[PDB]
Amino acid sequence: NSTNLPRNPSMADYEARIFTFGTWIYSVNKEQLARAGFYALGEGDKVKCFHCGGGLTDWKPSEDPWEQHAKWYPGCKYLLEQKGQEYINNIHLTHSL
Numbered sequence: 001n002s003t004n005l006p007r008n009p010s011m012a013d014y015e016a017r018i019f020t021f022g023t024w025i026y027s028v029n030k031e032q033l034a035r036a037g038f039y040a041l042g043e044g045d046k047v048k049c050f051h052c053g054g055g056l057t058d059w060k061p062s063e064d065p066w067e068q069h070a071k072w073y074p075g076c077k078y079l080l081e082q083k084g085q086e087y088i089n090n091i092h093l094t095h096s097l
């Protein structure tokens with residue numbers, strides 16, 4: 001019929017997300033992480049996408065969350081929505097060496 005809404009529709013609001021990044025000890029921008037649909041799980045730099053539940057760790061001190069979301073989770077709709085299919089495609093294209 002119609003499909004694909006978020007698994008944890010309680011992390012849909014940016015506020016709810018930066019909420020968790022209060023005790024964030026990492027140089028990976030909390031805001032860009034939250035703004036990218038991410039939220040800390042409570043262990044390490046372990047985050048997830050609120051929509052596609054895509055998990056990410058091992059963040060480099062200067063990674064751009066938006067680039068990572070594309071790469072690891074191309075089929076996220078939230079990503080598609082905020083960034084558009086060219087972005088995702090462009091990211092993946094630059095990757096190629």
Ligand SMILES: CN[C@@H](C)C(=O)N[C@H](C(=O)N1CCC[C@H]1Cn1nnnc1Sc1ccccc1)[C@@H](C)OCC#CC#CCO[C@H](C)[C@H](NC(=O)[C@H](C)NC)C(=O)N1CCC[C@H]1Cn1nnnc1Sc1ccccc1
Binds near residue numbers: 059063
């Ligand atoms: C650099 N920028 C950061 C953001 C980054 O890229 N981080 C990477 C990362 O977090 N990734 C890579 C894609 C997946 C994601 C990890 N992930 N996925 N899901 N959750 C997570 S982390 C997490 C976990 C819990 C809560 C929140 C987050 C990565 C470096 O982090 C490590 C991790 C982990 C984990 C795991 C899942 O493992 C796979 C499912 C797989 N296991 C299987 O049973 C598969 C289905 N069977 C084939 C797996 O571990 N594999 C598959 C073949 C062998 C191994 C791959 N491998 N080889 N050597 N090391 C590895 S582990 C690995 C995983 C992804 C990329 C590279 C290496």
Ligand SMILES: [Zn+2]
Binds near residue numbers: 078
């Ligand atoms: Zn996602």
